[PDB]
Design an enzyme around this catalytic site. Structure first.
Site, PDB file in Angstrom:
ATOM      1  N   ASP A   1     -44.771 -15.471 -37.982  1.00  0.00           N
ATOM      2  CA  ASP A   1     -43.358 -15.799 -38.167  1.00  0.00           C
ATOM      3  C   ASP A   1     -42.388 -14.969 -37.357  1.00  0.00           C
ATOM      4  O   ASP A   1     -42.004 -13.847 -37.733  1.00  0.00           O
ATOM      5  CB  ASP A   1     -43.072 -15.564 -39.657  1.00  0.00           C
ATOM      6  CG  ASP A   1     -41.712 -16.109 -40.012  1.00  0.00           C
ATOM      7  OD1 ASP A   1     -41.026 -16.654 -39.130  1.00  0.00           O
ATOM      8  OD2 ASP A   1     -41.345 -15.987 -41.193  1.00  0.00           O
ATOM      9  N   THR A   2     -41.939 -15.492 -36.214  1.00  0.00           N
ATOM     10  CA  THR A   2     -41.017 -14.741 -35.364  1.00  0.00           C
ATOM     11  C   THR A   2     -39.644 -14.576 -36.010  1.00  0.00           C
ATOM     12  O   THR A   2     -38.936 -13.699 -35.532  1.00  0.00           O
ATOM     13  CB  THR A   2     -40.815 -15.386 -33.986  1.00  0.00           C
ATOM     14  OG1 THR A   2     -40.397 -16.741 -34.138  1.00  0.00           O
ATOM     15  CG2 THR A   2     -42.147 -15.418 -33.258  1.00  0.00           C
ATOM     16  N   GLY A   3     -39.344 -15.386 -37.015  1.00  0.00           N
ATOM     17  CA  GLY A   3     -38.098 -15.316 -37.774  1.00  0.00           C
ATOM     18  C   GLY A   3     -38.063 -14.288 -38.890  1.00  0.00           C
ATOM     19  O   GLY A   3     -37.015 -14.138 -39.573  1.00  0.00           O
TER      20      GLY A   3
HETATM   21  C1  LIG Z   1     -40.321 -17.549 -45.123  1.00  0.00           C
HETATM   22  C2  LIG Z   1     -40.852 -18.630 -44.167  1.00  0.00           C
HETATM   23  C3  LIG Z   1     -42.206 -19.180 -44.639  1.00  0.00           C
HETATM   24  C4  LIG Z   1     -39.820 -19.777 -44.081  1.00  0.00           C
HETATM   25  N1  LIG Z   1     -38.558 -19.143 -43.717  1.00  0.00           N
HETATM   26  C5  LIG Z   1     -38.470 -18.924 -42.264  1.00  0.00           C
HETATM   27  C6  LIG Z   1     -38.546 -17.408 -42.039  1.00  0.00           C
HETATM   28  O1  LIG Z   1     -38.834 -17.142 -40.667  1.00  0.00           O
HETATM   29  C7  LIG Z   1     -37.282 -16.695 -42.510  1.00  0.00           C
HETATM   30  C8  LIG Z   1     -36.038 -17.047 -41.683  1.00  0.00           C
HETATM   31  C9  LIG Z   1     -34.881 -16.238 -42.261  1.00  0.00           C
HETATM   32  C10 LIG Z   1     -34.583 -15.000 -41.705  1.00  0.00           C
HETATM   33  C11 LIG Z   1     -33.591 -14.264 -42.334  1.00  0.00           C
HETATM   34  C12 LIG Z   1     -32.970 -14.760 -43.470  1.00  0.00           C
HETATM   35  C13 LIG Z   1     -33.120 -16.031 -43.983  1.00  0.00           C
HETATM   36  C14 LIG Z   1     -34.147 -16.706 -43.336  1.00  0.00           C
HETATM   37  N2  LIG Z   1     -37.488 -15.245 -42.398  1.00  0.00           N
HETATM   38  C15 LIG Z   1     -37.412 -14.396 -43.425  1.00  0.00           C
HETATM   39  O2  LIG Z   1     -37.302 -14.740 -44.595  1.00  0.00           O
HETATM   40  O3  LIG Z   1     -37.464 -13.082 -43.113  1.00  0.00           O
HETATM   41  C16 LIG Z   1     -37.422 -12.153 -44.189  1.00  0.00           C
HETATM   42  C17 LIG Z   1     -38.814 -12.004 -44.786  1.00  0.00           C
HETATM   43  C18 LIG Z   1     -39.444 -10.868 -43.980  1.00  0.00           C
HETATM   44  O4  LIG Z   1     -38.433 -10.285 -43.166  1.00  0.00           O
HETATM   45  C19 LIG Z   1     -37.163 -10.766 -43.589  1.00  0.00           C
HETATM   46  S1  LIG Z   1     -37.263 -19.898 -44.349  1.00  0.00           S
HETATM   47  O5  LIG Z   1     -36.053 -19.294 -43.711  1.00  0.00           O
HETATM   48  O6  LIG Z   1     -37.283 -19.718 -45.814  1.00  0.00           O
HETATM   49  C20 LIG Z   1     -37.296 -21.594 -43.950  1.00  0.00           C
HETATM   50  C21 LIG Z   1     -38.043 -22.487 -44.694  1.00  0.00           C
HETATM   51  C22 LIG Z   1     -38.056 -23.835 -44.302  1.00  0.00           C
HETATM   52  C23 LIG Z   1     -37.358 -24.222 -43.163  1.00  0.00           C
HETATM   53  N3  LIG Z   1     -37.398 -25.477 -42.724  1.00  0.00           N
HETATM   54  C24 LIG Z   1     -36.619 -23.308 -42.430  1.00  0.00           C
HETATM   55  C25 LIG Z   1     -36.583 -21.975 -42.813  1.00  0.00           C
END
Ligand SMILES: CC(C)CN(C[C@@H](O)[C@H](Cc1ccccc1)NC(=O)O[C@H]1CCOC1)S(=O)(=O)c1ccc(N)cc1
Ligand SMILES: [Cl-]
Ligand SMILES: [Cl-]
Ligand SMILES: [Cl-]
Ligand SMILES: [Cl-]
Ligand SMILES: [Cl-]
Ligand SMILES: [Cl-]
Ligand SMILES: [Cl-]
Ligand SMILES: [Cl-]
Ligand code: NA
Ligand SMILES: [Zn+2]
Ligand SMILES: [Zn+2]
Ligand SMILES: [Zn+2]
Ligand SMILES: [Zn+2]
Ligand SMILES: [Zn+2]
Ligand SMILES: [Zn+2]
Lengths: 99, 99
Positions: free
Chosen positions: B25-27
């Site tokens: 997960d790059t996000g």
């Molecule tokens: C958690 C994953 C499995 C899914 N998420 C994507 C992730 O990359 C998510 C993106 C994000 C970054 C910062 C804040 C809010 C969201 N990162 C994340 O939470 O970072 C946290 C956990 C560790 O470090 C910080 S999602 O945003 O819930 C999501 C779900 C469905 C769709 N269609 C789009 C987005």
């Protein structure tokens, strides 16, 4: 274009010509953006992640320009704290995750 | 290893010997795993995701085995619906996003 991931891979995109900063996210199946209005023709969806769920509006065939490329893709709008370009747009752009 | 992102970039890994399914997960800035038990030597941390905030337990210098590599990294355990290896581990493995 190569993103080494030492910082968040965040770029400027134009959605329906409106500029938004977006996070390129391999962990997201779909794409979600806040602060833009895409109109009345959508399908309401619920997405979940860390910290819970949010209500979204799903829009198809939306004009997107990002990384010097233009594509038409599905976008959800909702109260996300960050704008996310998920795998539906990363694949339309031909992006890959490599080790 | 190339991930083309048409499917989720999910792999199996071991965290101190414990098998998990994880999403690359790059996000995600951090790496968050649910259910595994790493013991009582942790510090509380607060993590924000799409729906809001959760408490996590932060473990440093954890051995993890993934993609035929062995690294030591920080792992947070907490309530995530999907186990994620975020940029702290992706940069440790030398991964990048490419177009
Ligand atoms: C958690 C994953 C499995 C899914 N998420 C994507 C992730 O990359 C998510 C993106 C994000 C970054 C910062 C804040 C809010 C969201 N990162 C994340 O939470 O970072 C946290 C956990 C560790 O470090 C910080 S999602 O945003 O819930 C999501 C779900 C469905 C769709 N269609 C789009 C987005
Ligand atoms: Cl490689
Ligand atoms: Cl693929
Ligand atoms: Cl595939
Ligand atoms: Cl495939
Ligand atoms: Cl092992
Ligand atoms: Cl962070
Ligand atoms: Cl904290
Ligand atoms: Cl965080
Ligand atoms: Na309609
Ligand atoms: Zn333009
Ligand atoms: Zn809000
Ligand atoms: Zn594939
Ligand atoms: Zn082992
Ligand atoms: Zn699975
Ligand atoms: Zn964090």
């Amino acid at each position: 274009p190569q993103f080494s991931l030492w910082k968040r891979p965040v770029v400027t995109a134009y959605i329906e010509g409106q500029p938004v900063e977006v996070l390129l996210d391999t962990g997201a199946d779909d794409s979600i953006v806040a602060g833009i209005e895409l109109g009345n023709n959508y399908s309401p969806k619920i997405v979940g992640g860390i910290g819970g769920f949010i209500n979204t509006k799903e829009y198809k065939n939306v004009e997107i320009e990002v990384l010097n490329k233009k594509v038409r893709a599905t976008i959800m709008t909702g109260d996300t704290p960050i704008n996310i370009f998920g795998r539906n747009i990363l694949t339309a752009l031909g992006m890959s995750l490599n080790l």
